[PDB]
């Protein structure tokens, strides 16, 4: 399994994660590609890999509003080519605002309503990797079961 872990991080708290997550799916034997969403493109971006990790920051406390970067690629979802291939969200958030980690669910319902396969819950972790990295690892090991 080829996996793209497809970050949006606009002070590094969600890209540590994906950094993290590159890590420990590697290790588990994966080929593993890291792209930050400031330099992707929607069209056909599954191509070739068998699961896309997903994940950013939300910044519109009464309305959802995702990470600039990843925006686009959230709106675009519809071209990626998801349909059959497997999926899980990751956030970093901030649990004192509105929309607490909100990309994550709208990440699944989207994905889902496009033929993506989520194989788990998606993760939501406040700050960065190293303030909760039990819950980092504990998903890691729940896609690799799934994968
Ligand atoms: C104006 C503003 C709005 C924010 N809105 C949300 C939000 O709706 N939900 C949330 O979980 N966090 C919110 N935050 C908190 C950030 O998402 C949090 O700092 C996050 O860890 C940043 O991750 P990143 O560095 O990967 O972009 C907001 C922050 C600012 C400044």
């Excluded at 956030?91 to 319902?109: Q, T």
């Excluded at 889902?112 to 700050?127: D, F, H, M, S, T």
Aim: with cysteine; aromatic share 6%.
């Amino acid at each position: 399994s080829k996996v793209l872990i497809l970050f949006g991080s606009s002070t590094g708290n969600t890209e540590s994660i994906a950094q993290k997550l590159e890590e420990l799916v590697a290790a588990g034997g994966h080929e593993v590609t890291l792209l930050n969403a400031a330099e992707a493109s929607a069209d056909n971006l599954a191509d070739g890999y068998d699961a896309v990790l997903m994940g950013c920051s939300a910044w519109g406390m009464e309305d959802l509003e995702l990470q600039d970067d990843f925006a686009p690629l959230f709106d675009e979802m519809e071209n990626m080519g998801l349909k059959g291939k497997k999926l899980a969200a990751f956030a970093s958030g901030d649990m004192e605002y509105e929309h607490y980690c909100g990309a994550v669910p709208a990440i699944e319902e989207k994905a889902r309503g496009l033929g993506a396969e989520v194989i788990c819950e998606g993760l939501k972790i406040e700050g960065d990797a190293s303030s909760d990295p039990d819950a980092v690892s504990a998903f890691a090991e729940d896609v690799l079961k799934k994968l």
